Amino acid sequence: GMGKEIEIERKTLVSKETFKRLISQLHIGEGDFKLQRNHYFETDDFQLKKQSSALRIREKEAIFTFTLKQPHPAGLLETNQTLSKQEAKLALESAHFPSGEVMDALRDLSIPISQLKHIGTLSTSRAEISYEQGILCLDHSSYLGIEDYEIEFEGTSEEHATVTFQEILKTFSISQVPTENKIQRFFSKKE
Numbered sequence: 001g002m003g004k005e006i007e008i009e010r011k012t013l014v015s016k017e018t019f020k021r022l023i024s025q026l027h028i029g030e031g032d033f034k035l036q037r038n039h040y041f042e043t044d045d046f047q048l049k050k051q052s053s054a055l056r057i058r059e060k061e062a063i064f065t066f067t068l069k070q071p072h073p074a075g076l077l078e079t080n081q082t083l084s085k086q087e088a089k090l091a092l093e094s095a096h097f098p099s100g101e102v103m104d105a106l107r108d109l110s111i112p113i114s115q116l117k118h119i120g121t122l123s124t125s126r127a128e129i130s131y132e133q134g135i136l137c138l139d140h141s142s143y144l145g146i147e148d149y150e151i152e153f154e155g156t157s158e159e160h161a162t163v164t165f166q167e168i169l170k171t172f173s174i175s176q177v178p179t180e181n182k183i184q185r186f187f188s189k190k191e
C-alpha cells in the first residue's frame with residue numbers, strides 16, 4: 001500500500017556455485033544486480049528482536065528508506081518511510097529519528113527510541129525477476145568480514161507462496177536449508 005505492505009516471503013541460503021548457476025539459468029545479467037546497504041538499529045538488550053521486529057534504514061541509488069518490520073496475522077507488516085540524506089545521517093550518527101509512521105509504530109510497541117542505535121551495516125547485491133505470480137530475488141550479501149548467497153520468493157498468499165517456492169527448489173534443484181533473516185544472520189554473527 002501507500003507506505004505500508006504485507007510481506008509474504010520464502011527463502012533459503014545457497015552456495016556460491018549454486019548462486020552462480022542460478023544467475024546463468026535464469027538469464028540474469030551482471031547489470032541487473034543493484035547494490036543496497038541495510039543499516040540496522042536495535043537496543044542494547046535487543047527489544048526489537050524480542051518483539052520479532054526489525055528496524056533498518058536502507059540506502060539504494062541515493063534513496064534512503066526507513067523501514068520497520070513487525071508481526072502480522074499473515075506474514076509481516078512492513079512500514080516504509082522515505083528519508084532525506086540529512087534525516088538518514090542524523091539517525092545513523094546520533095540516534096535522532098524523524099517523526100512519522102515508523103516512529104508511531106515503534107512507540108505503539110513500547111520501544112524506547114532513546115535506547116535505539118546503529119548496530120551495523122549489511123550490504124546486498126540484488127537481482128529481481130517476476131516469477132509466476134510473484135517476485136524472485138537473488139541476494140549476495142556481505143557483512144562483518146564474511147558473505148553469503150540467498151534466493152527468496154515474494155508471494156501474495158502464504159499458501160500459494162509455499163507451493164511456488166517448493167516448485168522453484170525442485171525445478172532448479174536447490175536443496176533447502178534453515179535460513180533466518182539477513183538482520184538475524186547479521187547479529188547472530190555479531191554475537
Ligand SMILES: [Cl-]
Nearest residue numbers: 123125141142
Ligand atoms: Cl555485496
